[PDB]
Design an enzyme around this catalytic site. Structure first.
Site, PDB file in Angstrom:
ATOM      1  N   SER A 144       0.821  -1.200   0.000  1.00 55.11           N
ATOM      2  CA  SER A 144       0.000   0.000   0.000  1.00 55.11           C
ATOM      3  C   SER A 144       0.860   1.258   0.000  1.00 55.11           C
ATOM      4  O   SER A 144       1.581   1.439  -0.981  1.00 55.11           O
ATOM      5  CB  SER A 144      -1.012  -0.115   1.102  1.00 55.11           C
ATOM      6  OG  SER A 144      -1.578  -1.392   1.124  1.00 55.11           O
ATOM      7  N   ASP A 252      -9.118  -2.650  -6.155  1.00 58.46           N
ATOM      8  CA  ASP A 252      -8.485  -2.421  -4.862  1.00 58.46           C
ATOM      9  C   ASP A 252      -9.383  -1.594  -3.936  1.00 58.46           C
ATOM     10  O   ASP A 252      -9.968  -0.586  -4.342  1.00 58.46           O
ATOM     11  CB  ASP A 252      -7.151  -1.719  -5.093  1.00 58.46           C
ATOM     12  CG  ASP A 252      -6.401  -1.476  -3.816  1.00 58.46           C
ATOM     13  OD1 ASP A 252      -5.639  -2.375  -3.409  1.00 58.46           O
ATOM     14  OD2 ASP A 252      -6.602  -0.393  -3.212  1.00 58.46           O
ATOM     15  N   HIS A 298      -7.139  -5.729  -0.533  1.00 56.04           N
ATOM     16  CA  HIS A 298      -6.097  -4.716  -0.353  1.00 56.04           C
ATOM     17  C   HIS A 298      -4.912  -5.362   0.348  1.00 56.04           C
ATOM     18  O   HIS A 298      -5.083  -5.916   1.440  1.00 56.04           O
ATOM     19  CB  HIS A 298      -6.623  -3.514   0.457  1.00 56.04           C
ATOM     20  CG  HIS A 298      -5.676  -2.348   0.506  1.00 56.04           C
ATOM     21  ND1 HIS A 298      -5.124  -1.782  -0.623  1.00 56.04           N
ATOM     22  CD2 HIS A 298      -5.190  -1.642   1.556  1.00 56.04           C
ATOM     23  CE1 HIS A 298      -4.339  -0.776  -0.274  1.00 56.04           C
ATOM     24  NE2 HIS A 298      -4.365  -0.670   1.045  1.00 56.04           N
TER      25      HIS A 298
HETATM   26  C1  LIG Z   1      -2.525   0.707   4.105  1.00 57.40           C
HETATM   27  C2  LIG Z   1      -3.833   1.091   3.916  1.00 57.40           C
HETATM   28  C3  LIG Z   1      -4.116   2.179   3.109  1.00 57.40           C
HETATM   29  C4  LIG Z   1      -3.045   2.835   2.514  1.00 57.40           C
HETATM   30  C5  LIG Z   1      -3.344   4.044   1.612  1.00 57.40           C
HETATM   31  N1  LIG Z   1      -2.409   4.182   0.498  1.00 57.40           N
HETATM   32  C6  LIG Z   1      -1.825   5.519   0.532  1.00 57.40           C
HETATM   33  C7  LIG Z   1      -2.035   6.221  -0.809  1.00 57.40           C
HETATM   34  C8  LIG Z   1      -3.333   6.456  -1.265  1.00 57.40           C
HETATM   35  C9  LIG Z   1      -3.541   7.093  -2.486  1.00 57.40           C
HETATM   36  C10 LIG Z   1      -2.428   7.504  -3.264  1.00 57.40           C
HETATM   37  C11 LIG Z   1      -1.156   7.273  -2.814  1.00 57.40           C
HETATM   38  C12 LIG Z   1      -0.942   6.620  -1.570  1.00 57.40           C
HETATM   39  O1  LIG Z   1      -0.261   7.781  -3.781  1.00 57.40           O
HETATM   40  C13 LIG Z   1      -1.012   7.988  -4.946  1.00 57.40           C
HETATM   41  O2  LIG Z   1      -2.341   8.160  -4.520  1.00 57.40           O
HETATM   42  N2  LIG Z   1      -1.795   2.458   2.717  1.00 57.40           N
HETATM   43  C14 LIG Z   1      -1.504   1.418   3.480  1.00 57.40           C
END
Ligand SMILES: c1ccc(CNCc2ccc3c(c2)OCO3)nc1
Ligand SMILES: c1ccc(CNCc2ccc3c(c2)OCO3)nc1
Ligand SMILES: *[C@@H]1O[C@H](CO)[C@@H](O)[C@H](O)[C@H]1NC(C)=O
Length: 352
Positions: A144, A252, A298
């Site tokens: 993520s 996702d 996810h």
């Molecule tokens: C666990 C759960 C949720 C997340 C969210 N992910 C972050 C994120 C979101 C949108 C984005 C991005 C980064 O860079 C481009 O647009 N991470 C880990």
């Protein structure tokens, strides 16, 4: 169990100024090294970082972190990890809230430190005295926000090792669940607080708040003020020189959240969801090392049951093994695996 080491360079810190660190399990008979970047969203101003400190403090501080069990790709048991069970294992906790992009210290002008890009550099540095100097392959992996962090940092790790005199170590990336689209949302809100701000606008503000850094070739394409583009995989990937394998669920859950979709289905939403899968599949058409199942989920690579899902009859650990062989097509050993059916769970091997 992987054991905690806090960074000897105490100027490289988590958000609250406590030292950053890493968890390590050595395998002294192996020349392979896996460095995994944890995920967990981000914060982009004083008000939302303050809230995160109250109820997500392990993502902002090391004060409450001694051991952790390795799971999935970080497991040392071949039963759980058919791919790299004998490797040296490193888990790098995410305590900078900056998608691993920041290069700013806490100071008289900065309530918080955002040092994700510098944390990665310092971990690699300290590991080079603990066995990494003898490596043949360094795989920088992450899930993520950590998957996006792989895309932002893999070429910087490669340049670092070359400049330190280790040009023969092969640096590669594995980005899991960090390939997002700056697509049209299902419902829309103007960017006015944390919940209403779309990723393009939140990242633009974050970069300024964090002093965030992006890869040099991508930065030269988009130029000053447009660095947010390099946080989107389909735009940054063609600028990278290191080999990168992309793992991405076609539907996702984090992508759907940022698109203002809640699954809890009439024609409009049916068409929206099918179009999202089609667009994601399109962006992976020319990515030769990829694994993209038609599921609503996810993350995957540190889940203990990561071995269960398959695309066209091939599991993710097998695909990663085929990737290794390809870097030495292959009969019965594919590396590009993208589903083509158009609805979540049309693949029977999807997680429940
Ligand atoms: C666990 C759960 C949720 C997340 C969210 N992910 C972050 C994120 C979101 C949108 C984005 C991005 C980064 O860079 C481009 O647009 N991470 C880990
Ligand atoms: C070791 C070092 C630091 C801490 C945090 N102590 C509370 C605190 C002070 C200043 C802060 C902050 C939090 O967030 C931004 O600025 N704990 C253990
Ligand atoms: C400690 O980290 C800072 C931040 O990257 C760096 O500027 C400095 O050179 C480092 N010091 C040592 C001794 O590694």
């Amino acid at each position: 169990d992987l054991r905690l080491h806090l960074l000897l360079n105490t100027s490289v810190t988590c958000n609250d100024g406590s030292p950053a660190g890493y968890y390590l399990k050595e395998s002294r008979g192996s020349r392979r090294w896996l460095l995994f970047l944890e995920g967990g969203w981000y914060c982009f101003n004083r008000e939302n970082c303050d809230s995160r400190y109250d109820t997500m403090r392990r993502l902002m501080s090391s004060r409450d972190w001694r051991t952790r069990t390795g799971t999935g790709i970080l497991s040392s048991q071949p039963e759980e990890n058919p791919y790299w069970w004998n490797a040296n294992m490193v888990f790098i906790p995410y305590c900078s809230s900056d998608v691993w992009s920041g290069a700013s210290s806490k100071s008289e002008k900065n309530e918080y430190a955002f040092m994700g890009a510098l944390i990665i550099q310092e971990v690699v540095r300290e590991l080079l005295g603990r066995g990494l100097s003898g490596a043949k392959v360094l795989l920088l992996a992450g899930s993520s926000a950590g998957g996006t962090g792989v895309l932002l940092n893999v070429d910087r790790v490669a340049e670092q090792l070359e400049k330190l005199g280790y040009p023969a170590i092969q640096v590669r990336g594995l980005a899991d669940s960090g390939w997002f689209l700056d697509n049209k949302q299902y419902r829309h809100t103007d960017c006015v607080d944390t919940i209403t701000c779309a990723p393009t606008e939140a990242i633009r503000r974050g970069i300024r708040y964090w002093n965030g850094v992006v890869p040099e070739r991508c930065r030269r394409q988009f130029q000053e003020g447009e660095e947010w583009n390099c946080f989107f995989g389909y735009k940054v990937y063609p600028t990278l020189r290191s080999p990168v394998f992309v793992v991405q669920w076609l539907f996702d859950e984090a992508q759907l959240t940022v698109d203002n979709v809640h699954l809890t289905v009439q024609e409009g939403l049916r068409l929206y969801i099918q179009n999202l899968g089609r667009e994601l599949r399109h962006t992976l058409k020319d990515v030769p090392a990829s694994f993209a199942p038609a599921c609503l989920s996810h993350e995957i690579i540190i889940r203990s049951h990561w071995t269960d899902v398959q695309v066209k009859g091939t599991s993710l650990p097998r695909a990663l093994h085929c990737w290794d062989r390809s870097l030495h097509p292959l009969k019965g050993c594919p590396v590009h695996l993208v589903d083509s059916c158009p609805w979540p769970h049309c693949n029977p091997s999807c997680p429940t």
